[PDB]
Structures are given as structure tokens and as C-alpha cells.
From Swiss-Prot, chains A, B:
Name of encoding gene: mntR
Residue intervals passing through the bilayer: none
Organismal lineage: Bacteria, Pseudomonadati, Pseudomonadota, Gammaproteobacteria, Enterobacterales
Keyword Kinase attached: no
Family per similarity comment: Belongs to the DtxR/MntR family.
Domain remarks: It contains an N-terminal DNA-binding domain and a metal-binding domain.
Protein's UniProt name: Transcriptional regulator MntR
One GO CC term, this protein: cytoplasm
Gene Ontology biological-process entries: negative regulation of DNA-templated transcription; positive regulation of DNA-templated transcription initiation
Locations listed in the record: Cytoplasm
Residues annotated as domain HTH dtxR-type: 11-72
Organism name: Escherichia coli (strain K12)
Assembly: Homodimer.
Amino acid sequence: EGFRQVREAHRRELIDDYVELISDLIREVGEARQVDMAARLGVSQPTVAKMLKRLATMGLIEMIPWRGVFLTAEGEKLAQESRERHQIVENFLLVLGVSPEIARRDAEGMEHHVSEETLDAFRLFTQ
Amino acid sequence: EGFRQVREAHRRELIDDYVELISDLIREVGEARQVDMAARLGVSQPTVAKMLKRLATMGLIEMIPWRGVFLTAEGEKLAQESRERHQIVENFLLVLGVSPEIARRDAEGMEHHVSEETLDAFRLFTQ
């Protein structure tokens, strides 16, 4: 599998993606169902169900019968913070002059590998 | 598991890391053994052996009895190119003003999520 540090960083990125996904789903279609999450992640339903229980254990999500998944106050803030980091990187790349599509693409995959000091540096760039 | 596009990007990053690792090992200790590769990757020996056969099939590596693993001309160039991309990102972050340690860290994890247009933009930055 791998070094503890790397697995822990990978777990963190998964958590962020899951809570951002849930918020985006509620915001776009009004609900976040397990089947829709699975389809939008590209994974089976069993693995989504598996991650949801981990999230509940971390007090990040609440599951309601016939209504799907929702975020808790802690989970919604976590999603807001991830989104914010992705935006800082995206805006930085836009200031650099990268096409809007590519800027948004790279920012999504890059953010999780950007240290805090680097993100600050990106933010710094006002121009 | 996931979307084809994502799995293919992940496979690519693994290939680069493996060939860079092999070149770095030969350069630092004169040889690249499976047990040392496994230990330095944080994975078991079975998975390294598994990836090595995939690399041989791609004509990227050659395995020699009692001598370990070596790269082919194609494999050595692939490693040189990965290293180069990591360097472009690292230098870019240094120009930005990020500490040497963090610059090298983020560049390693970032490069695989940086599109070509973005890398050019990074290179562009001369300052």
C-alpha cells in the first residue's frame, strides 16, 4: 500500500472531494444520493457507502432516510475551505495567463499537492 | 476503481516515478534492486515485481541476473523528461520565493497534475 504519510494525505484529499461533491450536488440538483455520488466519482456504490460511514464517524455528514446525504456544520466548512484552495490556485493560473478551462483543470488536481506556504505565495500574486 | 482517464493518468505517473527511481538508484548507489525499490516506494516486493514486468512489456527496463534493473534508451529518456518537468515547477516556485525544501516537495507532487500549457507558463517566468 504505502508510507503512512502518503496514505494519510490521500485520505485527506478523498475527504475533501467527497464533501465538496455533496455540497455541489445539493447546490445543483437539490440532493446528494449514493448512486449519483458513485457515478460522479467513477466508483462503485459499495465504496461510496464505505466512505460515507467513515465521514459519519468524523461527524462530517448526516444521512437521512429517503433524502440522501447532507453535510454537518463541520463538513460544510471543510468543503468551503477545499473549494477556496482550488479557487486560489485557479485564480493564480488565470493571472498567469492559462486558458480558463486548463486553469480550472490543473487547479483541481494541483491543490491537494500544494503546501500552505506555496498557496500563500499564489494568493500573494495580485497582478 | 474509477474513470478510464483518471486510471490512465495514474498509470502514467507511476511509470515516471518508477523510471526516475531506477535512474536515481543507479546514480546514487550504483544499482537498482527490487527490494530497495519496494522499500523506497513504500510498497511490497510483489507489487514492484508486478510493475517491472509491465515496464519490460513497454520496453522501458531491462532486468539482468545478479545485477538488478536498468533502463533502456526509451526508459532513460522518459526519466529525464519527468525530472525536467519536476525541475521546471521547482524553479518556478523558487522564483516565486518558496523555501527550497517546500519548493522541491510541492514540485514533486504537483508536476503530474500540471498540464503542458501550464508548464510552459511556468517556464516562461524568467525573473
